[PDB]
Amino acid sequence: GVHTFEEESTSPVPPAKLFKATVVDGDELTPKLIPAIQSIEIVEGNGGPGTVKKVTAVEDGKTSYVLHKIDAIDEATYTYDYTISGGTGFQEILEKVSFKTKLEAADGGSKIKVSVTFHTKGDAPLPDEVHQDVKQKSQGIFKAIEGYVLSN
Ligand SMILES: O=S(=O)(O)c1cccc2cccc(Nc3ccccc3)c12
Ligand SMILES: O=S(=O)(O)c1cccc2cccc(Nc3ccccc3)c12
Ligand SMILES: O=S(=O)(O)c1cccc2cccc(Nc3ccccc3)c12
Ligand SMILES: O=S(=O)(O)c1cccc2cccc(Nc3ccccc3)c12
Ligand SMILES: O=S(=O)(O)c1cccc2cccc(Nc3ccccc3)c12
């Protein structure tokens, strides 16, 4: 089953700085800022579309990973589209979740435009708990980096 959500939020950080921290320096900063995430390793490609990253994390003493695949990336338009799937750490009811993110200038800061598509196994509805967990983690990473950028 396919479940789509669209959201907008704002940041006081201007788009080039926010894009650089979250997308270009994200693989270095995320493990430093999020206790559970141990590493983000490129397993295929060189940072362009098709690049696959292995994200390893620890929870309740156990180690697992998921795969992050770049669908599109363009620095000039602050565009970053990526898919989370597979590995040993992914939500059981999900085949994949695809993200389309875009920043634009707003009021000295950034407007953030997101489109999120959950692909559930078979014809399963998206449980509230799975929506909530993917959203909290997505927000957590983005907002940990944003706070870091504000501190510097
Ligand atoms: O929980 S997931 O829904 O995959 C998830 C969804 C959205 C963003 C995520 C970012 C990093 C790690 C995740 N999970 C993860 C879990 C265990 C080990 C490694 C990564 C993320
Ligand atoms: O949502 S339901 O209407 O039961 C449902 C309806 C139709 C197909 C479903 C397939 C898998 C899991 C479900 N439920 C489920 C229940 C608890 C937790 C996670 C998924 C499905
Ligand atoms: O939560 S939001 O404020 O849009 C948000 C804020 C900042 C960064 C985000 C990155 C990915 C998805 C989001 N939203 C999202 C929406 C539904 C499900 C999962 C994530 C992000
Ligand atoms: O902790 S929980 O709400 O369970 C939580 C569980 C899973 C993912 C989370 C992502 C961001 C923030 C949380 N809360 C949080 C609460 C206090 C300080 C920092 C983060 C998340
Ligand atoms: O991760 S902390 O452990 O604080 C940390 C530890 C050691 C050095 C740090 C340098 C800059 C920012 C941090 N964190 C940070 C995160 C969000 C907002 C402001 C600062 C640093």
Side-chain angles (χ1 to χ4, degrees), residues 1-61 63-152:
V2 179
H3 314 267
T4 302
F5 304 85
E6 288 167 356
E7 276 305 5
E8 293 189 15
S9 54
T10 61
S11 176
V13 181
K17 188 166 209 80
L18 188 49
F19 191 81
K20 184 175 150 38
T22 49
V23 180
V24 179
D25 296 342
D27 300 346
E28 181 248 321
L29 295 175
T30 299
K32 287 195 174 174
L33 295 180
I34 304 296
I37 295 173
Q38 305 303 291
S39 59
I40 308 189
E41 191 191 33
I42 289 195
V43 289
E44 168 65 11
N46 60 20
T51 299
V52 177
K53 312 181 191 164
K54 181 187 273 195
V55 182
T56 59
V58 168
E59 16 196 346
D60 320 303
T63 294
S64 58
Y65 67 94
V66 307
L67 289 316
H68 163 139
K69 181 155 210 211
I70 307 182
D71 306 314
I73 181 169
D74 184 70
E75 292 196 22
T77 60
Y78 320 111
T79 297
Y80 187 55
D81 305 347
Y82 63 94
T83 293
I84 304 172
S85 63
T88 53
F90 197 47
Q91 316 274 347
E92 296 295 332
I93 199 165
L94 288 185
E95 294 167 342
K96 62 173 179 184
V97 191
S98 72
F99 297 86
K100 302 188 74 212
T101 76
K102 191 188 155 151
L103 311 184
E104 53 179 82
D107 301 306
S110 303
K111 176 147 46 253
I112 311 139
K113 293 193 280 193
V114 172
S115 182
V116 189
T117 306
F118 295 78
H119 298 251
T120 57
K121 291 172 170 162
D123 297 342
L126 185 59
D128 288 334
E129 298 72 16
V130 173
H131 175 260
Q132 197 194 100
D133 189 53
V134 171
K135 183 169 173 89
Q136 266 180 315
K137 290 172 168 163
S138 293
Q139 279 180 316
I141 286 165
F142 188 92
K143 290 171 191 284
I145 292 167
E146 170 186 63
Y148 162 70
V149 170
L150 286 173
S151 81
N152 256 33

